[PDB]
Amino acid sequence: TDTTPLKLSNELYAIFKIHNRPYLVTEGDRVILPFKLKQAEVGDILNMTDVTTLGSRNYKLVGHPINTSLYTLKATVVGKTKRAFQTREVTKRRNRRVRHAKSKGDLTILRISELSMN
Amino acid sequence: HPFSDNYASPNIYVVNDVTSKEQKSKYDTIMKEIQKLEDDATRKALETARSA
């Protein structure tokens, strides 16, 4: 795998997958995972492993996943949080009972700190 | 009755339980005392002026 053009390029993107959910990122990008991370606390660093695609403007390395040796991709866990609280009402059409389906899903804000060809 | 020393980790602290009323009373006494000090000084200055 001649990974020289990617290595050379100033701009570079990745399409890493957390639980088969793809997230297309550059360095500085701020990923918002739609679940509560249990393993990592806030401040902890995540070394991304299942990286599908690593792309320049005109080239892209692709793997299933790409060799961990070829790249780096460090995210930082920058705040567990939640979505806004919502209460949709559930009811049938001639029935006074109206069940409130309250919802407030969890989020985990990551920040892609490092992304480079090793 | 917690204190800042009680917790033994220096980022933890307990703010001082001084009642608002007591603080107000203290303020009143201090500003009053200042006023008294000032008034006496002014009187003295007036007396000195009268003298010469």
Place this chain on the structure above:
Amino acid sequence: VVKAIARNSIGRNGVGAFVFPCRKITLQFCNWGGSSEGMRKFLTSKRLDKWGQEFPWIQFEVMRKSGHPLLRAEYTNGREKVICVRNLNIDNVENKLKLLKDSDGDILRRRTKNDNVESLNSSVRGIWSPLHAAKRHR
């Protein structure tokens, strides 16, 4: 001839040095008031010390007031969460405190489907153009 446009930089907290979002937490309780029992117990019982030991970048203020028991956090962005912990047991209070510390200070917000990444960066590949496409349309 060339001229500058006065412009300012955008701080990305994570990339260089991570500054921890939660900066200060205030435990507020009442000596009277049965709603403040669990808070009082928490304050008493060696958990707060452990917490402070764990997180020495957060300062932990402990205040007494007449009302309900309060957990107000204070974040780097300047926002302030305040959770009323009325009638909660010790463990519930601790969980609430954990939740607060976890939060990045930002306001809660509805996200649309797949609104995942938030970039300041211009696209690495360009924006599409019909004149510059690989397959020309018809």
Place this chain on the structure above:
Amino acid sequence: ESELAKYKEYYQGLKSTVNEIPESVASKSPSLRTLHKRLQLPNELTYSTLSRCLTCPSAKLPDKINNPTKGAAFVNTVPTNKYLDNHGLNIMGKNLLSYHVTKSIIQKYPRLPTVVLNAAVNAYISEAVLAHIAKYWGIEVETTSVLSRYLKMEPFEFTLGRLKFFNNSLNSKDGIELITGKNFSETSALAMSVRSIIAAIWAVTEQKDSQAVYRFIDDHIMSRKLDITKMFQFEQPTRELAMLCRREGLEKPVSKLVAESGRLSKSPVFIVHVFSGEETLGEGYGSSLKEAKARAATDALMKWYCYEPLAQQEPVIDPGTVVV
């Protein structure tokens, strides 16, 4: 006894602590400790030094205290020691910022125009930006009065931990600012504090790890996003491009239509490329032909200036700005 006397002795003690910044007292201050932990400052950087960095110069109380009727009262801070403030530190921090940031920018963009470079530098380390950074870190201002503090009966440790300058009480009350100098502005004080911290870090680490300061700066200041492409504003770019081509060993640039669609419409599209020989320099799209031509020239100039070489390359020293 008298409460005035009690207050007076407290004030005197506070003044003495400010003059000293005794190390034990500084250590006791929770806010300082948390700041230290937050920034991951070196262990050699003492807590007294950190307190000092937050202490702005304030030798004598100004004449504007005499009248709150004119919209100012300075009743929060207490006079400082002449030889224990953030002033010397601040200057050193400013110098460091001016050196390192500028150097980093030059490394990134070795042909960047002088004015553009200056603007970029400003963006990275402007006073407002520095103040914002300080706020983010948690450098809070001593807004509370001395008397109020005494009444509450709070320790001097907290005072030491907060930022200390001649902050005008009733600054914008009833929507009335007084427009005082830089020595009474909050933003400026915050900027000084962030520079002072940097200077303190430098002082402690220089002999052991010389580049520790610069990596701290990189982490905090140089980590911030700035698209350099948004900084530029050209005037007659075609002429400038032609001049550049003349200067280098390049053929005269001419603009040519590559592709065209929607001529005789409200919004056409004209793609023109500025060629020098067979090589294209700049690509320019536009609604009009003229616009497209202009855009191609601007693109070419961007490519010239914002060229960023690799770290593996030997240093690129540019041949100055293209003087049209």
Place this chain on the structure above:
Amino acid sequence: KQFGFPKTQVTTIYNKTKSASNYKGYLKHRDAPGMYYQPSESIATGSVNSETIPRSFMAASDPRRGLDMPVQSTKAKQCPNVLVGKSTVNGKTYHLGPQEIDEIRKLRLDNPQKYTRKFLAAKYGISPLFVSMVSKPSEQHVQIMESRLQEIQSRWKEKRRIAREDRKRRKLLWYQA
């Protein structure tokens, strides 16, 4: 061609002509592991990208010069000239001496209405721009012209003034990049 990577379109599993916006099809499309050449489907106007910068603007010691990525897709022979000056088509001429210049200057001051820039250009086989560069007119004439322009501007409606402002804003925006 330095690199001999296989080249790929940005491939959907669905019909691209009917469902170009459908991200799902793109997500589905897996391609075999390795290096590829995906030529960008974009103009290189705003890009500071290293794959976009031309070789002449790269430094001599740049490794990127040798690599084949600033692709010369277009050809200058095929493209026609746009808003090109007459000097660029048939070369610049430096023929007029000092005396001729002095005469031109004398003429222009004397009577800019009779001896206008275009007329001077026609006479001496040179550009109106060059005439301007050479010689100032009488400042009175300039003042008159400014006054005329002001009068014309005043003669506008509200709408026209707004349109002119918009045009000016657009022009300013062009030179931003």
Place this chain on the structure above:
Amino acid sequence: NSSERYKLKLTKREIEVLEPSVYAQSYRIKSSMKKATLLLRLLGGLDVMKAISQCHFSNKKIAREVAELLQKGVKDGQKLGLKPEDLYISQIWTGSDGFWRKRVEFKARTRIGIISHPYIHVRCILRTKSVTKRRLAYEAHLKEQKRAPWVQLGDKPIRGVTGGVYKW
């Protein structure tokens, strides 16, 4: 007589209120609110003198009362310091004056209605052409300056979510 500079910060509401105005009010006019509206809509943003003239030559009964009110507001403005040729009617509205006395209308074949007897008041706020109007002209000018132009081939946001994948 001082070397102290200042900068004033005021809300939109504060700005609005502090501009010189004058607040006319009618007495308990005998009319419907609808009838008042039918006239008062004509006297929207007029100069006070023009409005007064219109009221004088109006066929309606409320008109005279409106004219009188305008005259009173002018007089008040003069007393304050303002000029009558400077004053324009900024706002003029009406309202129910309350205590409308209901009274049954007896109809044929043991039917009824209730006849109310409406009383209203007209209030109006006169503002100055010299200040308020100038201010709003300035605001309009600023807004015009701010306004981003129509660009033909302009940068519109690629609306929709990306979907973790390049489509180009």
Place this chain on the structure above:
RNA sequence: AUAAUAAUAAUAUGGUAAUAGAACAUUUAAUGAUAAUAUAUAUUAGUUAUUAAUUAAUAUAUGUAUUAAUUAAAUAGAGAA
């Protein structure tokens, strides 16, 4: 051998008539710190898996909660007569 909180694996969680379990708002009675830096009510914007309460600002009242909490009870919750 319990309780609270948190993990892991599993199963379950549509619901009229109906049955069962658990809460909250409101008003009164018993007990009851505190205080205009306070309390109550209202508006706006935040916060807590949110009929509820809390934070801040603003407004008006009051030298002040039959207040928090536990019990006892109810003229205890209204788009349907």
Place this chain on the structure above:
RNA sequence: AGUAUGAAAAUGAUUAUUUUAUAAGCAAUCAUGAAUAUAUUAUAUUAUAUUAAUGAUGUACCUUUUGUAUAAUGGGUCAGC
């Protein structure tokens, strides 16, 4: 039908912001441009709030019925009961 107080709502007029004169149906929800307002950490390529560009989905509520968008019942609206 006490006395004070009263930004409780329905309801009327007026002003401001915003949308609206080639577009068709419970008038909402979700997507999504734009405009405006506020914001003593908008550092911004910022955040919230308001607003019928445009797109998609969407047959009031209750009662009574095997079954109701029903052109079956009942309600002019809000306040108190």
